[PDB]
């Protein structure tokens, strides 16, 4: 296939997502509320992307290391299997590793370097303490415009993210880096949320 163009780092607002069994977070009263990884796609410039490419299986010995880090903030939000590539994958890990991490090379050669990249990133740019510092905060109350989320995340980071809502609430942020890991915009999309939207808390 041809190699992908660009990479979106998706990113999950655990409050939209809880709105039970020990793969899901939605349990965890004691993590607070906040964006966590949904996965990072090999993307193509015209919208589609490659999927299910070919690779070493899902090893999670690759990323033992990981793991911590994996459970707390790539989690999954919910306990029936999902399926990717043929088959009902055993977690969130193995999903969008089968259906997006092999699309990943050569830019990121095994598992590990996908996850542990996809972590830097996810570290690297805090979007939840992006929103915090701007007076974005989790609120089972308050109801805030996206214009402003929008000009909040874009103000620092000097590209425009990708929003996408669940009813009424901020469900997933989208921000794209090129194949050398520097931010850059993502292809041009029409807005789907509400011109007021919501950042839900957990629970």
């Given at each position: 296939?041809?190699?992908?163009?660009?990479?979106?780092?998706?990113?999950?607002?655990?409050?939209?997502?809880?709105?039970?069994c020990?793969?899901?977070?939605?349990?965890?009263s004691?993590?607070?509320?906040?964006?966590?990884?949904?996965?990072?796609?090999?993307?193509?410039?015209?919208?589609?992307?490659?999927?299910?490419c070919e690779?070493?299986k899902?090893?999670?010995?690759?990323?033992?290391?990981?793991?911590?880090?994996l459970?707390?903030?790539?989690?999954s939000?919910?306990?029936?299997?999902?399926?990717?590539?043929?088959?009902f994958?055993?977690?969130?890990?193995?999903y969008?590793?089968?259906?997006?991490?092999?699309?990943?090379?050569?830019?990121?050669?095994?598992?590990?370097?996908?996850?542990?990249?996809?972590?830097?990133?996810?570290?690297?740019?805090?979007?939840?303490?992006?929103?915090?510092?701007?007076?974005?905060?989790?609120?089972?109350?308050?109801?805030?415009?996206?214009?402003?989320?929008?000009?909040?995340?874009?103000?620092?980071?000097?590209?425009?993210?990708?929003?996408?809502?669940?009813?009424?609430?901020?469900?997933q942020?989208?921000?794209?880096?090129?194949?050398?890991?520097?931010?850059?915009?993502?292809?041009?999309?029409?807005?789907?949320?509400?011109?007021?939207?919501?950042?839900?808390?957990?629970?």
């Amino acid at each position: 296939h041809k190699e992908f163009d660009y990479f979106t780092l998706a990113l999950t607002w655990s409050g939209t997502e809880c709105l039970s069994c020990p793969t899901n977070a939605c349990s965890r009263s004691e993590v607070e509320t906040g964006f966590t990884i949904k996965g990072l796609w090999p993307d193509y410039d015209d919208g589609t992307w490659p999927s299910c490419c070919e690779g070493a299986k899902y090893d999670q010995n690759e990323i033992s290391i990981l793991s911590n880090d994996l459970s707390k903030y790539w989690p999954s939000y919910s306990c029936p299997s999902s399926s990717a590539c043929g088959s009902f994958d055993a977690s969130d890990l193995a999903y969008e590793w089968a259906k997006h991490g092999t699309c990943s090379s050569p830019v990121l050669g095994n598992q590990y370097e996908y996850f542990s990249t996809t972590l830097m990133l996810y570290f690297k740019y805090n979007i939840s303490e992006i929103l915090s510092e701007s007076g974005y905060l989790p609120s089972n109350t308050a109801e805030y415009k996206v214009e402003g989320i929008m000009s909040a995340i874009q103000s620092a980071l000097r590209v425009t993210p990708v929003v996408k809502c669940k009813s009424d609430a901020v469900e997933q942020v989208q921000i794209c880096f090129d194949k050398t890991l520097q931010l850059q915009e993502c292809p041009s999309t029409a807005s789907t949320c509400p011109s007021l939207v919501s950042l839900p808390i957990k629970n």
